[PDB]
Amino acid sequence: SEFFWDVQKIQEISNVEEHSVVKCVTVNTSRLISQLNEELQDEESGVNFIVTQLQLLINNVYEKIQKSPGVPAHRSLMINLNFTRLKFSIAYWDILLERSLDLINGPSKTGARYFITEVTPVDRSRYVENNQYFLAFKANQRLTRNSVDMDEFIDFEILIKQIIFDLFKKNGIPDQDFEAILSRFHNLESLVVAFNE
C-alpha cells in the first residue's frame, strides 16, 4: 500500500561478465524492517507483505534504470538488490525474491535478473578486477563452451557407418550401389538431404 524501501543510489559493477551489465542498488531496509516486527503478528501475514514490497522494489528499480542513460542493448541486465540490513536469512530472501518474480508479468520480470545481498564495506568492482581465479574461471568457461573434447565421446565414424547402412537399407539401395553413392555425397549432411528432398 506504501513504499517501505529507501532506494539510495544505483552504481555499476563494471567488470563482472562481458555479456551482461551489472547494477548494484543500495536499499535501506530499516523502514521495511520496523514494519515487520512492530506491526506484523504472524509469519504468514508478513510473508505476503514482503512479497508485495519486493514487487514494488523490482518495478521501481527496473523503471529507474530504464530512464537512466544506461543502454543494456544486447547485454543481459542483472540487478543486484543490495540491502543495508537483511534481518532474516539470505536463504529466505532468495525464496521470496523468486516467488515475487514468479507473479510479475510486466517488462521488469522479462527484461532483467535480480539477486539480493547485504551491504558491506568491501569494494566489489575492485574485487572483480583483482581476483585472478575469477578471470581464470571466465576464460575457461568460454574455452569449454566453444570446444568439443572428442575423446569424451566414442568415435564419430561408428555412428556415421550406422546411419549410412540405415539410410541405404531404408531407401532400397543395393550393396553394388554403395560405392557410387558415397562418391556423390561426401558427408551425412549431403547424404541425408539427398534422401529426404
Binding site: 536469512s89 535478473r113 574461471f137 563452451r145 565421446f153 565414424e157 540405415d166 558427408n187 538431404v193 529426404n196
Partner: protein
C-alpha cells in the same frame, strides 16, 4: 501426463531423503541416469540442478582452479539452464557476509541461477518441487520407433530427456534434416556445444 526428471546415479544416497519425499508425488517419475555432469538432477532436456557447498567454494584444486570451477563449466556445455543450489551454514551471514555476493558475482551468468539454501533437507525438497512445477515435462509422444536411433543420440552425449524431447517432435532423420536447415525449433533444443558436436557428426567426410 506423468512428469519426469532424472537423478544422477552417483548422488542418489546423498539425496536419498530428498528423493523419498519427492517420490510421494504419484505424478512424478524419477529416472536414475548415468550422465556426464556432477549435477544432482536433470529437470528437463536442458535444465540441471547442482548442489554445492559455500564452505568449499574457495578451496583450491591441485591444477590451480577453485573447487567447483570445472564442474560448473562442464554443466554449461550441456545445459541451457544450470541451477546452482549453494548450501551454507547460517553462521556465514553473520561471520562472513561477503561470501554471498562473491559467489553470485563469480557465477554470474544469464544461463546460471544461483540460490542460497540452509543445510536442511526441507529447503532442497521445496526448491526441487518448485523446479519440477516450473520446468519439468512429461514426454508422452514418440515419433521415433527404432531404439538404435536413440542409442545414436545417447552416444553423442545427449541426456535421456533431451533425447525424449527430440523424439517427441522428430524422428532421427527429421531432426538431422531440421538441424541441417537450421529450423529454429530444433536449434533451440541444443547448447552451442551440442550444436557443434552434431555438425561435426553431419560434416565429417569419408
Amino acid at each position: 501426463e506423468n512428469k519426469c526428471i532424472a537423478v544422477n546415479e552417483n548422488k542418489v544416497i546423498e539425496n536419498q531423503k530428498v528423493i523419498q519425499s519427492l517420490c510421494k508425488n504419484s505424478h512424478l517419475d524419477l529416472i536414475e541416469q548415468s550422465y556426464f555432469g556432477e549435477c544432482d538432477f536433470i529437470i528437463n532436456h536442458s535444465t540441471c540442478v547442482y548442489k554445492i557447498q559455500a564452505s568449499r567454494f574457495m578451496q583450491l584444486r591441485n591444477n590451480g582452479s577453485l573447487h567447483y570451477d570445472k564442474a560448473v563449466n562442464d554443466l554449461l556445455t550441456e545445459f541451457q539452464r544450470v541451477i546452482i543450489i549453494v548450501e551454507f551454514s547460517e553462521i556465514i551471514q553473520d561471520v562472513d557476509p561477503d561470501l554471498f555476493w562473491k559467489i553470485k558475482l563469480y557465477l554470474l551468468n544469464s544461463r546460471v541461477d544461483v540460490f542460497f539454501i540452509h543445510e536442511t533437507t526441507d529447503f532442497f525438497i521445496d526448491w526441487m518441487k518448485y523446479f519440477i512445477a516450473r520446468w519439468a515435462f512429461s514426454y508422452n509422444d514418440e515419433k521415433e520407433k527404432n531404439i538404435a536411433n536413440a542409442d545414436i543420440l545417447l552416444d553423442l552425449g545427449f541426456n535421456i530427456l533431451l533425447v525424449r524431447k527430440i523424439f517427441q517432435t522428430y524422428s532421427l532423420e527429421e531432426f538431422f534434416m531440421a538441424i541441417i536447415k537450421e529450423e529454429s525449433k530444433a536449434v533451440k533444443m541444443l547448447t552451442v556445444s551440442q550444436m557443434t558436436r552434431l555438425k561435426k557428426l553431419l560434416t565429417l567426410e569419408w
